[PDB]
Design a protein around this ligand. Structure first.
Ligand SMILES: [Mg+2]
Lengths: 49, 49, 97, 49, 98, 263, 49, 49, 99
DNA sequence: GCCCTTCGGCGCCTTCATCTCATCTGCCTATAATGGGAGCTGTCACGGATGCA
DNA sequence: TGCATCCGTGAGTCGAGGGTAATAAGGCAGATGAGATGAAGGCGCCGAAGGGC
């Protein structure tokens, strides 16, 4: 299973958090299996339904 | 007379053994040694030109 | 550390192929993530992975940091051959050169 | 015979400034103590303690 | 403490009246702990004996580094100073120059 | 049975069958997740050696996963009693072949464990360290094997632990690289090769070539006599004779003294 | 017995105890074969450490 | 990046250089010292070399 | 100068052996193997360096030859199943009086 | 005085099968056994996210 | 928007000085590569000597 490089997730600037517009407190909860994220949503399938 | 006699304080080597990971010669009197040419002396040698 | 990575990866492979409840699979994936974490940089997150003698293990990052790292210990300054060392004594009868 | 006009470098840790490494010419001496010229002590910050 | 843990583990796994203190006791951790202390510990060091005074001064010496103590990097400037209470208790002159 | 050598599944024999399949799946998962507490409770006594706590917990989880399949309710005992044996088996097996940097087969990690237990049980009863001959008497095996297993069980050490009383250097700084070239014996070997070439060129060319390909100097392989005959158009007895001539002339003290010095 | 006589003078490089280890095997150089062929020296199957 | 990574905060500058795909010129003093090239000062410049 | 071990004895001149005082005739290369065994008595023998020193370096044959030769040494002098010429699995053979 | 060319003689030297001896890998054991041991943290200064409010 | 709150960086130069520890684990079947065996073929080497030019 894929894993995240610590050099980029964890640091004084969280580079992964900067790119993805999140926070390290809102990334450790995910790449360490504490909370889910919504990978993608269906926009039209929700607009008509 | 202090226990810093020159007989136990003179050391020199031409070609002794070397370390495993890096091929630098080892250090100390038990091993054949080799004086450490640190970066501070690198500063002096660079300043000399 | 490489043995830990290999063990976790093999056990995760066994869990996936066998078919296990998602809690155990998630725990194994977390252990894999933390094992790669320890391999790349031990002690960066959480308590460092410790071996015998109760000392932090030397990961890849710790081999490139500080005075004892490769950069300022083996690259910048090296132990050299054709060298010696001894006590100094005044030589008042010597010439300047 | 072979030490005829062969320069040899002398250094003292710590090497603060450029003059902390000086190239002399060596003369064979009995004993086991390197004989330093008294004048170059100040440049070396060397002392005989 | 290790002894108490192991004996607490063992006293329940065996039926009553079939259990004896000898089988409740496994002296291995105690000797392991004393061997751990006496060797490979920096507070019990190789005797510095090259004259009677060195032997005398190696004992009756007060150290501050080790388990429960402060390392030299952890040591500030204030601790290294001489306290007015040092008088008569700890010599203010005898201390290594390093 | 119905997929291969079956038929188009009707309404009541497909959806209901898959539903009981999924129901059994979630029932197994439910009891498994309920009983992981037993695994984590049992793994507490197993830490402190070899592997970490959570690794042991995971291996016990795998053991329980295996155990739930073979658990038989018809025999009428609590599931914990049967599951404990399988969990212990999985943990012991994993600690045997996974907790060592130098992996050791279980068949003889068993005898290391038994040797340790018997020696430490007899030490307190006798009051002294048990001599390996007496341990062998308790083994019903030769003592030499006892010393062999004693020296096998020794685990490797770390190259990077600070070795001094004060922290200044690591162990790996004090280990000499044996594989490194001496840089003195290399020049000696080159000069020896030069001396050999001079000596051989001093000899007759046919003899020099014969011995050179006899000991495989110029090439990688020494050759048998018939190869020498095929490359020089002579019989193998003639090559034996010329070899006799070679080491006869090579015993000459002019070459003997000039080459024997090189040792 | 293989060790220095008591009351005997030694210096740097002198042998102290004669301990001989089975050398096992290695690449016997062809030049070694010609060397033993010139003097009749035995293979000396052990390593003198 | 090679000079900066050998001075301070090695992991941070290393990660930043990896992200930016920084191409070092291997032209400075410390870089040439590291890679074994002639230092670009004194007797290392093309006027004197 | 004759080299002896337990009940086997060798004369370096005329290349014969006594086994417990009984003279025995034996093959030349087989005799060289026995010479290696006595010259390194108490030290284990491995097939490779046995091949390296005793045999020519041009030997292109298989590995069964040395095992067969050891079998001949067994059937000539150490006829007993347990024998002074012990064998080590993967490490070869050794000449040693059993304990 | 020995080369050119012989039968065969067991040896011997391999080589093919072809058997055993450790050595190692996977599987099974049914009263019940159901939630971490332990960790000691705090130098000095200095730039920056940070959880809330 | 503060604003404490913390969180990761820096902190010397050569030399005395080497290595410290638990636990329920056990029969049993199969297999597998190493090493023990026996048998048969392709020369070796001679034991004979042929012989003459
Ligand atoms: Mg001074």
């Amino acid at each position: 299973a894929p894993v995240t490089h610590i050099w980029y997730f964890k640091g004084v600037p969280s580079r992964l958090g900067y790119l993805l517009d999140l926070a390290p407190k809102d990334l450790e909860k995910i790449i360490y299996f504490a909370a889910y994220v919504i990978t993608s949503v269906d926009e039209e399938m929700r607009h008509n339904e | 007379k202090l226990h810093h006699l020159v007989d136990d304080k003179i050391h020199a080597r031409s070609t002794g053994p070397y370390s495993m990971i890096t091929q630098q010669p080892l250090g100390g009197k038990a091993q054949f040694g080799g004086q450490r040419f640190g970066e501070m002396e690198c500063w002096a040698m660079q300043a000399y030109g | 550390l490489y043995r830990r990575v290999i063990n976790r990866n093999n056990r995760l492979k066994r869990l996936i192929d066998l078919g296990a409840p998602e809690i155990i699979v998630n725990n194994e994936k977390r252990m894999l993530q933390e094992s790669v974490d320890a391999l790349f940089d031990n002690g960066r997150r959480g308590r460092p992975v410790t071996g015998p003698g109760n000392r932090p293990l030397k990961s890849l990052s710790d081999l490139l940091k500080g005075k004892q790292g490769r950069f300022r210990q083996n690259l910048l300054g090296k132990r050299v051959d054709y060298s010696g060392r001894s006590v100094i004594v005044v030589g008042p009868q010597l010439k300047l050169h | 015979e072979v030490i005829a006009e062969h320069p040899v470098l002398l250094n003292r840790a710590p090497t603060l400034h450029r003059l902390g490494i000086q190239a002399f010419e060596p003369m064979l001496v009995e004993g086991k103590a390197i004989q330093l010229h008294p004048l170059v002590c100040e440049a070396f910050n060397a002392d005989f303690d | 403490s290790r002894m108490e843990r192991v004996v607490r583990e063992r006293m329940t796994t065996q039926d009553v009246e079939a259990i004896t203190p000898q089988t409740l006791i496994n002296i291995r951790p105690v000797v392991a702990a004393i061997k751990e202390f006496f060797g490979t510990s920096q507070l019990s060091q190789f005797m510095d004996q090259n004259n009677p005074l060195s032997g005398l001064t190696h004992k009756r010496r007060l150290s501050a580094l080790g388990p429960g103590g402060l390392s030299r990097e952890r040591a500030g400037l204030e601790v290294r100073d001489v306290h007015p209470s040092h008088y008569g208790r700890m010599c203010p002159i005898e201390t290594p120059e390093g | 049975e119905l997929s291969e050598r079956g038929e188009k599944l009707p309404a009541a024999q497909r959806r209901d069958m898959m539903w009981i399949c999924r129901d059994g799946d979630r029932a197994k998962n439910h009891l498994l997740e309920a009983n992981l507490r037993l695994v984590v409770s049992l793994a507490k006594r197993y830490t402190g050696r070899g592997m970490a706590f959570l690794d042991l917990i995971q291996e016990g989880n795998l053991g329980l996963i295996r155990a739930v399949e073979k658990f038989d309710y018809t025999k009428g005992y609590k599931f914990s009693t049967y599951a404990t044996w399988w969990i212990r088996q999985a943990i012991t097996r994993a600690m045997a072949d996974q907790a060592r940097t130098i992996r050791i087969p279980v068949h003889m990690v068993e005898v290391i464990n038994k040797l340790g237990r018997i020696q430490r049980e007899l030490l307190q009863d006798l009051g002294r360290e048990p001599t390996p001959e007496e341990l062998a008497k308790e083994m019903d095996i030769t003592p030499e094997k006892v010393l062999e297993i004693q020296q096998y069980a020794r685990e490797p050490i770390s190259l990077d632990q600070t070795i001094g009383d004060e922290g200044d250097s690591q162990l790996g700084d004090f280990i000499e690289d044996s594989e490194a070239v001496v840089a003195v014996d290399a020049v000696s070997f080159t000069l020896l090769q030069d001396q050999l070439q001079s000596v051989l060129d001093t000899l007759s060319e046919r003899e020099a070539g014969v011995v050179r390909l006899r000991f495989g100097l110029t090439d990688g392989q020494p050759r048998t006599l018939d190869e020498i005959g095929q490359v020089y158009g002579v019989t193998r007895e003639r090559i034996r004779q010329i070899e006799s001539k070679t080491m006869s002339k090579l015993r000459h003290p002019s070459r003997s003294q000039v080459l024997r010095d090189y040792l | 017995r293989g060790i220095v006589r008591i009351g005997a003078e030694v210096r740097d490089g002198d042998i102290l105890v004669g301990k001989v280890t089975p050398k096992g095997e290695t690449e016997l150089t062809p030049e070694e074969r010609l060397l033993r062929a010139i003097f009749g020296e035995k293979a000396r199957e052990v390593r003198d450490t | 990046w090679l000079s900066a990574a050998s001075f301070q905060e090695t992991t941070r500058v290393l990660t930043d250089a990896a992200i930016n795909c920084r191409s070092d010129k291997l032209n400075g003093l410390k870089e040439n010292v590291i890679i074994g090239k002639l230092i670009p000062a004194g007797t290392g410049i093309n006027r004197y070399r | 100068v004759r080299l002896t071990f337990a009940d086997i004895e060798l004369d370096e001149e005329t290349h014969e052996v006594w086994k417990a005082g009984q003279p025995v005739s034996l093959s030349p290369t087989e005799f060289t193997l026995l010479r290696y065994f006595v010259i390194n008595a108490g030290t284990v023998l491995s097939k490779p360096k046995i091949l390296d020193h005793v045999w020519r370096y041009d030997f292109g044959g298989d590995v069964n030859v040395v095992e067969s030769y050891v079998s001949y040494l067994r059937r000539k002098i150490d006829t007993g199943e347990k024998r002074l010429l012990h064998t080590l699995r993967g490490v070869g053979y050794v000449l040693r009086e059993p304990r």
